[PDB]
Amino acid sequence: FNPESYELDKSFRLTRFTELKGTGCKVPQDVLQKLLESLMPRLGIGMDTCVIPLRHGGLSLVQTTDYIYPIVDDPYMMGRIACANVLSDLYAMGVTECDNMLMLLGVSNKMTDRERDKVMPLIIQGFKDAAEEAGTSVTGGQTVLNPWIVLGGVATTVCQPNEFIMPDNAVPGDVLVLTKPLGTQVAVAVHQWLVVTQEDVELAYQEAMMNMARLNRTAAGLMHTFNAHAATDITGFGILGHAQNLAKQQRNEVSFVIHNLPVLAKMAAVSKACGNMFGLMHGTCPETSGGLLICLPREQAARFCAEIKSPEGHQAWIIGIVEKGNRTARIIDKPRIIEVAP
Amino acid sequence: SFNPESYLDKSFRLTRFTELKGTGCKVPQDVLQKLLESLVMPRLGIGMDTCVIPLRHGGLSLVQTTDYIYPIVDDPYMMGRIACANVLSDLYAMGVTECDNMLMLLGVSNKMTDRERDKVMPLIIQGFKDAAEEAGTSVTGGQTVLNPWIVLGGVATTVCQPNEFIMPDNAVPGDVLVLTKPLGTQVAVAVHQWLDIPEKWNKIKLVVTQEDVELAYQEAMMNMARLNRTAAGLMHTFNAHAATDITGFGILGHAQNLAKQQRNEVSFVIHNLPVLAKMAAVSKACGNMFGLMHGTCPETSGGLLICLPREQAARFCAEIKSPGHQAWIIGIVEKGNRTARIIDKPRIIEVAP
Ligand SMILES: Nc1ncnc2c1ncn2[C@@H]1O[C@H](COP(=O)(O)OP(=O)(O)O)[C@@H](O)[C@H]1O
Ligand SMILES: Nc1ncnc2c1ncn2[C@@H]1O[C@H](COP(=O)(O)OP(=O)(O)O)[C@@H](O)[C@H]1O
Ligand SMILES: [Mg+2]
Ligand SMILES: [Mg+2]
Ligand SMILES: [Mg+2]
Ligand SMILES: [Mg+2]
Ligand SMILES: [Mg+2]
Ligand SMILES: [Mg+2]
Ligand code: NA
Ligand code: NA
Question: Where does the record place the site Important for catalytic activity (chain B)?
């Protein structure tokens, strides 16, 4: 995306139409659980999708919703990233197919009509192609004026019981697998700012951009192939936030321990230099369109890692262990930081 | 019937955490259409009120819908009830009386202190929850984000057998048009916000009193929290041919949208308009701000507009009213080219509280 390539000015930045926060835009985890107080397997609020058994066919309706604001300055990719973020919640349940999507848009009241008319069709394009890759399509939605640009949607599947994997079958000795590297907030943060070189910055942003656009759909499928016991996706609450919520969901008395952190190279050094702006090393640094965190028996684990890389392929990491415990999660006192080069 | 005193600033208003416009906040119909251009059992995609998606499973099809809005009333719990009624309002356009699940869409203003949050956001949530229970459904997922504004919406989804819904495409000449709630909500909510503004009140004051505005507001609030579900069930009983619901694009914007969908070569003509008492006078005192007389005034959680056999519309109204809230026959269907209009001098019916 070259702005001036679209009769737009030089100073335009899609990221102008929102604010940047080190800790993200979502309402914090403890506050939501509080406010959300008045509210065949079935799954209510608390996890990555709902699972609502139906009257018809012993079928279950599985659905999920998402919305975010611009984090990269390339409108096509950002819509790809939007559509991918919605579908991620489905994939943490293992459902490889999407029966239907609805799209949420918010058009900023600060953008010229000419900016809107160039930038929106690009975004709407990124969303469609990504949906096509997922084997689905958008058939409705809602579009309204807002102070900021908003992007989001709904994914919905009507499943037979074999299609999904309840997020709660972990046992002591399983290992934790993560399929995308950490640090997406830091990378988007520093790029807008244009310890690290201008070159270190551009390679990071381009890499984070690419990984955010990649679908968790292949991973969902290999969780069946390799008999996964539970999974979540890593989004706004960060690696530790989502780990802690998965754990509390377990049927068995287990606890999670994460040993190493696969981070986009150089981004650890940035978060570190910014004290408590991010908290990358504490595990609460928000992710966007992160990968899957999966509880797999030790044998299924290397095999799963081998096949995701060389099926097109993408690397995944062994990051921690499942142990007898009281359903909590924690990162170790001094984690190993794997620096993953572009 | 709300006061920030118990629970906030005596000055606290919920409608402060957005920005009110006579023409509402939607991306205008026309602009919208040219942004979406890219994107056997009957099917329904983008355009009307819901999708209808045939699933490879025992003759089922997916029916669903979404919506989001901003505060238009200062009563939080009642704002919860209304944001939910509006999400469902779309399901009820297809004659679909059941809802198999809901999700919520929630935004907190980054402008509202922590005290205000843990006191106000519960109210909205319980209202939403109370509405879903009335509709015999519940909220089992959603999304909650910071925004400059307070944000309210959600998702409604049903998995339907073939005769659970009514395809909005089978209108014929001689059919008539029933409206199930009176118009003018965008005027009523506005004027309740203009009490607190000296420059706006000084002008409208020549046209209505404080008690009348208090009144039209309270009436508007109850109508907008009123579900369309009963109307939905009666569409089946009295052989409805087609319906759409009246929301952001006004009585005409949405009448035109539905006349586009018809199989037959038919058009709609609207002869009268039921409108909350006094609101149409207020509209005129404000120039081209609203356009409540031309049919381009925004409604939120407005009514259903139903094409009914000329012989049946009358039983329908009797039934919806006697057992109840009144409905009105506002026009007719005739041979035409899939368009719709308001007659030049429409008859205004002043619905009192
Ligand atoms: N971002 C979007 N992507 C795809 N379809 C959309 C989007 N926004 C709105 N729509 C669809 O456009 C049509 C008109 O929108 P709207 O006026 O909001 O009607 P409704 O509330 O009755 O669905 C509807 O079918 C709606 O689902
Ligand atoms: N306003 C709301 N109403 C109902 N459920 C909600 C709401 N906000 C969040 N949730 C639910 O609370 C849980 C936490 O939200 P979130 O972290 O956004 O989940 P996820 O990222 O897995 O989609 C999710 O299960 C979500 O469905
Ligand atoms: Mg998730
Ligand atoms: Mg999510
Ligand atoms: Mg809508
Ligand atoms: Mg509608
Ligand atoms: Mg609607
Ligand atoms: Mg979420
Ligand atoms: Na979810
Ligand atoms: Na809809």
Answer: 26
Place of tokens 């570190």: A272
**Inter-chain residue contact B159 with A128, CB threshold 8 Å:** no
User: Which superfamily does CATH assign the domain made up of A1-19+49-164 to?
Assistant: PurM-like, N-terminal domain (3.30.1330.10)
- Nearest by Cα to B196 from B183, B214, B184: B214
B19-34 burial string, b = 16+ CB within 10 Å, else e?
A: ebebbbbbbeeeeeee
Q: Residue B103: beta bridge partners?
A: B155
In the sheet that B51-54 helps form, which strands lie side by side, from edge to edge?
B51-54, B61-69, B151-160, B101-109, B139-147
Q: Say if residues B93 and B131 touch (Cβ distance below 8 Å).
A: no
Is residue B45 a known part of a binding site? no
Superfamily of domain B20-49+166-353: PurM-like C-terminal domain (3.90.650.10)
Residue pair A186/A271 in contact by the 8 Å Cβ criterion: yes
CB nearest A35 (choices: B100, B121, B143): B121
Query: Which of left, alpha, beta for B95 (phi over 0: left; psi -120 to 50: alpha)?
Result: left
Rounded to the nearest 10 degrees, how much is the dihedral formed by the CA atoms of B22, B26, B27, B29? -90
Q: Please tell me the distance from the alpha carbon of residue B169 to that of residue B172, in angstroms, as a whole number.
A: 9
Instruction: Find, among A6, A50, A24, the residue nearest to A290 by Cα.
Output: A24
Q: Are strands A175-178 and B340-351 parallel, antiparallel or unpaired?
A: unpaired
What is the resolution in angstroms? 2.0
Experimental method: X-ray
**What's the alpha-carbon Rg for chain A, to the nearest Å?**
20
How far apart are the CA of A90 and the centre of ligand 3, in A?
8
